[PDB]
Amino acid sequence: ILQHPDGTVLKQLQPPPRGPRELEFYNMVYAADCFDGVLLELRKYLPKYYGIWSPPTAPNDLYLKLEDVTHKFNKPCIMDVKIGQKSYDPFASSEKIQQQVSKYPLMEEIGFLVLGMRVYHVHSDSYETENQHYGRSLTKETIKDGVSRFFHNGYCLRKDAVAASIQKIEKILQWFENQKQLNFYASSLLFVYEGSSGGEVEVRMIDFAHVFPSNTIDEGYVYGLKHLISVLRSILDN
Numbered sequence: 543i544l545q546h547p548d549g550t551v552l553k554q555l556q557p558p559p560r561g562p563r564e565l566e567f568y569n570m571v572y573a574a575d576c577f578d579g580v581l582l583e584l585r586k587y588l589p590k591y592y593g594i595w596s597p598p599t600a601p602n603d604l605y606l607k608l609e610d611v612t613h614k615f616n617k618p619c620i621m622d623v624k625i626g627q628k629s630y631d632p633f634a635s636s637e638k639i640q641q642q643v644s645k646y647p648l649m650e651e652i653g654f655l656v657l658g659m660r661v662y663h664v665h666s667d668s669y670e671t672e673n674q675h676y677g678r679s680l681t682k683e684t685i686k687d688g689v690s691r692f693f694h695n696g697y698c699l700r701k702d703a704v705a706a707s708i709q710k711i712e713k714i715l716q717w718f719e720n721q722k723q724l725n726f727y728a729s730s731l732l733f734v735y736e737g738s739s740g741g742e743v744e745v746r747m748i749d750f751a752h753v754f755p756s757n758t759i760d761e762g763y764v765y766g767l768k769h770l771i772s773v774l775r776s777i778l779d780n
């Protein structure tokens with residue numbers, strides 16, 4: 543993900559079929575002639591999309607030009623959380639389903655997975671980062687404390703950012719409770735708050751290489767959001 547100074551990032555398309563599917567998702571949602579109310583409302587929760595991009599001398603090399611959701615922050619604290627009970631799509635082979643469930647076998651039980659975090663610590667004027675193995679190590683016994691770490695700045699728990707995150711997730715949940723036309727697999731929520739207020743908190747949906755047409759509620763995604771809200775809610779009692 544290449545960061546441009548003008549507040550928009552360039553996300554390289556994943557290899558096929560994943561990159562192409564993510565391009566068609568953004569194109570569908572941000573279609574200039576779209577008047578589907580479900581899709582127009584969905585735009586509120588995604589990074590703004592500026593179209594396909596490639597370097598002038600390299601039309602082979604495909605990127606999505608997207609809003610940098612951290613741009614308005616001075617010391618952004620960033621957490622990426624995968625949502626859903628299944629991290630594989632409805633058309634995966636048995637081998638791939640097994641590979642995806644083995645990556646984190648608690649996905650069905652918990653409904654979400656912390657992919658990484660970058661947290662600003664006030665006393666040291668520095669960041670502490672957690673990679674993919676942090677969230678994959680969390681169980682039902684340790685998910686609450688695992689999530690809490692994102693909101694602890696070295697001297698206090700940022701309950702303002704926790705409460706704001708609940709309020710922003712709730713609008714996303716309401717969108718999912720009022721649509722029956724898309725199911726989202728291996729998609730995420732990007733959380734951002736100000737490390738240096740309630741407070742600039744940004745919560746945005748990202749990662750759309752496995753979004754499919756459907757006739758039903760995305761039950762796995764709803765389950766994940768609800769459980770994530772419940773965990774964040776319990777953190778307010780710390």
Ligand SMILES: COc1cc(O)c2c(=O)c(O)c(-c3ccc(O)c(O)c3)oc2c1
Nearest residue numbers: 551553589608609610611612620748749
């Ligand atoms: C579909 O994918 C997207 C779309 C986006 O719009 C952003 C985005 O805006 C962003 O800041 C980041 C990001 C930047 C720096 C980090 O350290 C980090 O963990 C995430 O990832 C994105 C991914």
